[PDB]
Amino acid sequence: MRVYFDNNATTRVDDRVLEEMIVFYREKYGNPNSAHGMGIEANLHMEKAREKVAKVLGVSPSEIFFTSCATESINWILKTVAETFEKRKRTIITTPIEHKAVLETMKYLSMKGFKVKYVPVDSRGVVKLEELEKLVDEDTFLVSIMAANNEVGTIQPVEDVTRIVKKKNKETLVHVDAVQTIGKIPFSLEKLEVDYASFSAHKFHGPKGVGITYIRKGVPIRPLIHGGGQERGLRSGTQNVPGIVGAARAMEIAVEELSEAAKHMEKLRSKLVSGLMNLGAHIITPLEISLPNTLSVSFPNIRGSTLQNLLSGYGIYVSTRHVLDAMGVDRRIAQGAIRISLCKYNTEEEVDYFLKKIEEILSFL
């Protein structure tokens, strides 16, 4: 029995999404920048996609840009926006629980002479709003925060973070790494009042190689990739049409079925929680404020990587620090931590299997 419990890492493409993609690989394979019939045709579907996305996120088609992945989007927004504020501003604010896409870019901007401050998080993984108000000064031009954490699943108070920031400084811009929202928790930008958002299609049953970017009309931005002039001159290179069509279709479906999907995952998760604790596990994920599919747990007397290998031997897939560290998690617990991340297609039959097999692995040890 193949049990895939690592959906925060990546997911399988939805059969419906793949079917549509195939059309643009075999038949409508034209270059959206061409003026002939097939060019005109591909461009239509690329734009319908951009529209499907804008609609789901509650924004204007012109505010959606397509990249190669969330990482590229994050590099692009952080690097070029910092680039527009050179010799004018220099303070950037973020948190220690961000994905390395963000953290590593910040490290880069520091090398370049930028001041990168880090707002701490509480024991549950939630950013500390009080410290945020303080840390934000007049020299602060950009605040980069994530909507939910990929390792533990902790949801951040994006609304509050935004409000608190606007008050302390009305000119500061806000970027939201929303990669883990789509298909797991509602996320709309319509009234969120943020300026930049990043997404990765393969995290919600879309294909790999496609990133989705939200850039509020008017805010600063520049090309990370100069060239032919695609994406309104802001991101060149031939667009990935089969990829874009699929990504849009995947977002639409993912959100459309969110409600029923979350309830289902929320249920399976509860079964895992009680079962794992009865076997001796420690629950790191704060159930009351996290993605309903994410469950980070630890068996103190076993290396997470060892539990990971054993489980993999039975056809079960899960994953296995700077986040737990930022949370103050004890080194012993961190060392044995693993992450179980469920999708809409996981089942109770699978949960029963995981519980049954991990109990064996634990007994043999």
Next chain:
Amino acid sequence: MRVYFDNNATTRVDDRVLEEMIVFYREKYGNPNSAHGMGIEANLHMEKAREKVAKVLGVSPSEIFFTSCATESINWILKTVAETFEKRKRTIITTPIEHKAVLETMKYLSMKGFKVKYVPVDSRGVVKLEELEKLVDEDTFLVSIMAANNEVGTIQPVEDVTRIVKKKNKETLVHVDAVQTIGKIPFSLEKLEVDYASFSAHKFHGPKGVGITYIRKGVPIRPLIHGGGQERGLRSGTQNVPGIVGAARAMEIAVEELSEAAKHMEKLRSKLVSGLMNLGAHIITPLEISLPNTLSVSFPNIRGSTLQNLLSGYGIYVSTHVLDAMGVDRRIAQGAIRISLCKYNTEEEVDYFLKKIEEILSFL
């Protein structure tokens, strides 16, 4: 929101109490048995502690002995008192709802040749007085009873129990496990007419690792721990001065604010009972005669441990033979979880608990 509802197991130390302890760890760390200045200084403070407790409990300092915990106090008293009645008396009476500290010590003495009798309890968990009058006989040298049960909260008729035992035999000694009293229900030994009483500081915001023992001036007793002669030669070993100073200060506070604390906890508890019944909860705790902070509830088709696990995942802590002695059905017993407040819990927390336990019930 971290919601701690397991204060019958243990509690967080009062900031006031900890402030006082630290002084004896880094500054006044002398050994109370020393003749030099620092020895004297420590001894002075340890004796004030003993005096603060005697005052609070309404007895004489000389009748207060410090131990490592309630369990040690209980072992010490039952075993040594029993020891002094070897080849003389052989009957010990107690109840089936006692804490294992007592029950296991009893199981121990039985194996050692003593005759242990168990008075039954009614459905609410209250000891059966009539049955007690008959059990007590001429060969009964000691009766061990708790002032309030820790799992269901049922309060015991200590006054009556002592009265009834005195009438049936003016010589029988009475020991009371008063661990669950302090800070929750008033409890004074002044006129209670008992011979022994056990306590555990960490149940009322005192530090763990400290037991308080009451022994009536005159009654039998012997060392459980032989040695240097500390605690009037009855409990040797270096005294946990920081622990003692803190325990006495915790006891003084808990009782000084008993009135307000109990009213507050009683309120929070009623709101809980109200909301939990509105969710189908069976209430096991007898509301009319229990601790104002204790609430044992059970759900029809949900194992307590399971319910406990989920609640814990949300930052809510509750715990999961007492129910058996009460005649509570296996079905119900298996779903029972124990909610045990403290002076510091809040209504904001009660709302969270109720709000979150409902969500949890939907997934089950």
